[PDB]
Amino acid sequence: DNVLRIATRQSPLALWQAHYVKDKLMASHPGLVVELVPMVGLFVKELEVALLENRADIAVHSMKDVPVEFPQGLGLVTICEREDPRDAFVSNNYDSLDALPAGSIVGTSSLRRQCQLAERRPDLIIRSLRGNVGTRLSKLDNGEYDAIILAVAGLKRLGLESRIRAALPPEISLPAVGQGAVGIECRLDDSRTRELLAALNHHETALRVTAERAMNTRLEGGCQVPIGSYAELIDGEIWLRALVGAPDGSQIIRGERRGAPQDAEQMGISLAEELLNNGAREILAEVYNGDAPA
Ligand SMILES: *Cc1[nH]c(Cc2[nH]cc(CCC(=O)O)c2CC(=O)O)c(CCC(=O)O)c1CC(=O)O
Numbered sequence: 001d002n003v004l005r006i007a008t009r010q011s012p013l014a015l016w017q018a019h020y021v022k023d024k025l026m027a028s029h030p031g032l033v034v035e036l037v038p039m040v041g042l043f044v045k046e047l048e049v050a051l052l053e054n055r056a057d058i059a060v061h062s063m064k065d066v067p068v069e070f071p072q073g074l075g076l077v078t079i080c081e082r083e084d085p086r087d088a089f090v091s092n093n094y095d096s097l098d099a100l101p102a103g104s105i106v107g108t109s110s111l112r113r114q115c116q117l118a119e120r121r122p123d124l125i126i127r128s129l130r131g132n133v134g135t136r137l138s139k140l141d142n143g144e145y146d147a148i149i150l151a152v153a154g155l156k157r158l159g160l161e162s163r164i165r166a167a168l169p170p171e172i173s174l175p176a177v178g179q180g181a182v183g184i185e186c187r188l189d190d191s192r193t194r195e196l197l198a199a200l201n202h203h204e205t206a207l208r209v210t211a212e213r214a215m216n217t218r219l220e221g222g223c224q225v226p227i228g229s230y231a232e233l234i235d236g237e238i239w240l241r242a243l244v245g246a247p248d249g250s251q252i253i254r255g256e257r258r259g260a261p262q263d264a265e266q267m268g269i270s271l272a273e274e275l276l277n278n279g280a281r282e283i284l285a286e287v288y289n290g291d292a293p294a
Contacts, residue, residue: 003033004196007047007056010038011132016157017060017182021080021200028199041067041222048074051186057193058186062154063178063209066185068217078184078197082205084152085180085230087113087173088164090140091147096166100124100146107136107145111226111247111287116173117149118249133158149173153180174228174243177212177221181205204233207261211240214268219244219276219284220293226283231264238264242271244280247287253280 004025008018015038022034037056039046044067047059051074066076094100100121107129108114114126129136129145133154140148152167184200186193208231221227228243237258245252255278257271276293285292 001192002031003035004193005035005037005055005057007037007039007050007059009043009047010040013062013133013154013158014038014060017062020157020182021058021060021184024080024200025196029196032196041065048185057190058184058197061183061185063181063183064176065223066178066183067222068213068220070185073187073189074185075188076183076185077188077194078201079178079206079209080182080184080200081202082181082208084156084167085175086152086170087149087168087175087179088152088155089147089166089168090137090150090155090163091165092140094147094165097121097147097168104146105144107139107148110149110176111224112176112228112245113149113173115226115245115247115249115252116228116243118247119245119252120172120249122249133160137163151175151179170230170241174241175230176223177216177227177229178209179230181209183209207231207238207264208233211238211264211268214265215240215242215272216268218269218272218293219280220288220291225287229268233261234258237261238267240267240271242275244275244283246283251279251283253278253283 006018008014018036050056102123105125105127107127109128109130117126155161155163211231212229215229226245231238231240238261240257243254253275255271255274257267259267281292
């Protein structure tokens with residue numbers, strides 16, 4: 001077949017990523033007919049059902065939303081070129097985090113962003129914030145939050161880069177696994193589709209996210225977990241940093257690992273176990289409601 005059906009969420013951002021993949025596909029294969037099959041973790045389960053019942057051929061996600069476990073037959077096969085993986089500080093009245101006076105309300109529902117925020121500034125009020133980027137920016141403007149933390153990649157792709165007051169360095173707010181990268185899921189036995197996707201995969205980014213995901217997989221993580229996992233390719237080696245923290249910032253467990261690109265997965269697993277054997281297991285047990293990594 002020459003038709004390629006892309007399943008995707010229906011938010012402005014999700015549709016941006018869908019177009020991104022489509023464009024890349026069209027450029028590598030001028031004869032391919034790409035159809036979008038948008039549809040309303042729960043933010044991935046419906047797309048996976050579409051894949052299993054042949055209503056779509058591939059599903060485009062933001063890497064950090066991709067779960068660590070896949071139903072048999074499905075899997076991640078392509079990881080596209082990574083964008084700015086950093087968190088961004090967005091605010092209208094203030095220019096930085098240090099500038100926020102005591103009692104300021106920062107919005108984010110990410111435990112990863114919160115635990116790190118609270119570790120440095122116990123005086124701030126971290127308040128939950130949910131919805132598409134557009135609604136989040138709306139609530140900020142309505143005055144419900146003094147500031148909010150969002151990813152740099154999302155704002156840039158939406159052309160809302162001017163919203164970024166300051167990009168928070170990884171040392172301050174360690175990025176979520178795969179933040180800034182787009183990943184494509186599809187049926188493992190679908191050779192044709194996989195062959196078409198080969199041109200979109202970005203080796204270096206795949207190296208980094210693999211180390212990040214291996215770490216997360218061992219910890220049995222996801223979005224609702226206070227886990228940071230970020231890798232860089234430094235002078236031919238992968239530098240992996242990871243953290244697990246208590247949502248109140250009182251206890252944050254940190255570790256790092258460095259090694260050859262081909263050991264990306266084992267480095268991830270090793271670092272994860274190191275965190276686990278150092279208390280991460282007790283913290284994660286809270287967040288998981290009894291459940292804790294093996
Ligand atoms: C795992 C997780 N997902 C989200 C929501 C989300 N998913 C993708 C993006 C855009 C950035 C990207 O594609 O890399 C976003 C929104 C964003 O981060 O700007 C979150 C955010 C929850 C929140 O802040 O309320 C998370 C949790 C996490 O990042 O740790």
